[PDB]
Amino acid sequence: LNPELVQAVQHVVIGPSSLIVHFNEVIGRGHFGCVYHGTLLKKIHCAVKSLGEVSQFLTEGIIMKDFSHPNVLSLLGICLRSEGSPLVVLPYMKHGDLRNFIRNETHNPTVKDLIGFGLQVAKGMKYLASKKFVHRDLAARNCMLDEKFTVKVADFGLPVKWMALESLQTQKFTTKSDVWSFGVLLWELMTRGAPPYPDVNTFDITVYLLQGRRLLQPEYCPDPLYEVMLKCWHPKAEMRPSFSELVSRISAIFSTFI
Numbered sequence: 001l002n003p004e005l006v007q008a009v010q011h012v013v014i015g016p017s018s019l020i021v022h023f024n025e026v027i028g029r030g031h032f033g034c035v036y037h038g039t040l041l042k043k044i045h046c047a048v049k050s051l052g053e054v055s056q057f058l059t060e061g062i063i064m065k066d067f068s069h070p071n072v073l074s075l076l077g078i079c080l081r082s083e084g085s086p087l088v089v090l091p092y093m094k095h096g097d098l099r100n101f102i103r104n105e106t107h108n109p110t111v112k113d114l115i116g117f118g119l120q121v122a123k124g125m126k127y128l129a130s131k132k133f134v135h136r137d138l139a140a141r142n143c144m145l146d147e148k149f150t151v152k153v154a155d156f157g158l159p160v161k162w163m164a165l166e167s168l169q170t171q172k173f174t175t176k177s178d179v180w181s182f183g184v185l186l187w188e189l190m191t192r193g194a195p196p197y198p199d200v201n202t203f204d205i206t207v208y209l210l211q212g213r214r215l216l217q218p219e220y221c222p223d224p225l226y227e228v229m230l231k232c233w234h235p236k237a238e239m240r241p242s243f244s245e246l247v248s249r250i251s252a253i254f255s256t257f258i
């Protein structure tokens with residue numbers, strides 16, 4: 001391991017002197033996989049995700065440790081223990097992921113609340129793009145809801161039905177292909193967690209998109225908001241709106257919505 005990477009990652013490292021990991025306490029009955037309840041000691045409730053590649057993990061830890069924004073889930077720290085797997089320590093999200101929350105028949109957020117959630121994902125994505133951070137897996141399942149219903153962009157994971165055309169063809173990813181995925185997320189929000197392209201199988205998604213065909217406008221989705229989704233799925237990556245434009249446009253729709 002490069003000794004400078006080791007020096008630079010020490011500020012991200014957390015150990016047993018402050019972190020109690022409750023390995024017999026899984027979060028959300030197994031929804032997120034190997035993610036356990038944790039306590040950071042002055043008590044803080046956290047989520048402890050259990051996982052050459054070590055180099056890239058330390059690098060990501062450094063990058064994610066800097067994230068500070070109300071709509072981006074924070075990296076509280078990482079564990080690099082002599083015995084066992086690497087751990088990722090994140091803040092505990094009271095209402096789990098966004099897809100599950102809105103799919104649940106016992107939750108009924110209004111049309112305006114769903115637009116509000118989308119506005120929050122846009123703001124988190126505007127911040128991530130400002131740091132040149134390409135997500136590669138932006139979906140409702142990867143957005144978390146805290147105790148005050150604040151949406152926080154996160155990653156708990158090919159999601160071919162969320163990828164942009166150029167990513168399906170060339171395998172390359174950019175902030176512009178994240179904008180495409182954001183459009184599908186807005187669709188998930190307006191459909192209340194319905195799966196995108198139910199009649200189009202994974203292997204034929206590219207041909208469906210090349211034919212100029214897109215996700216249909218969900219009922220109760222405002223026409224200006226559907227226009228925004230269509231801009232997110234522009235076949236030319238350079239013509240898609242930025243997350244700053246998506247914030248401006250969605251705030252306008254949100255504040256005027258009747």
Ligand SMILES: C[C@@H](c1ccccc1)n1cc(-c2cc(F)cc(F)c2)c(=O)[nH]c1=O
Nearest residue numbers: 060061064073074075078088153154155156
């Ligand atoms: C901070 C947050 C996140 C990620 C992306 C966008 C926004 C927020 N996050 C980070 C990791 C993570 C942390 C690492 F230190 C190394 C690594 F490989 C992953 C994770 O597993 N889950 C998760 O939600």
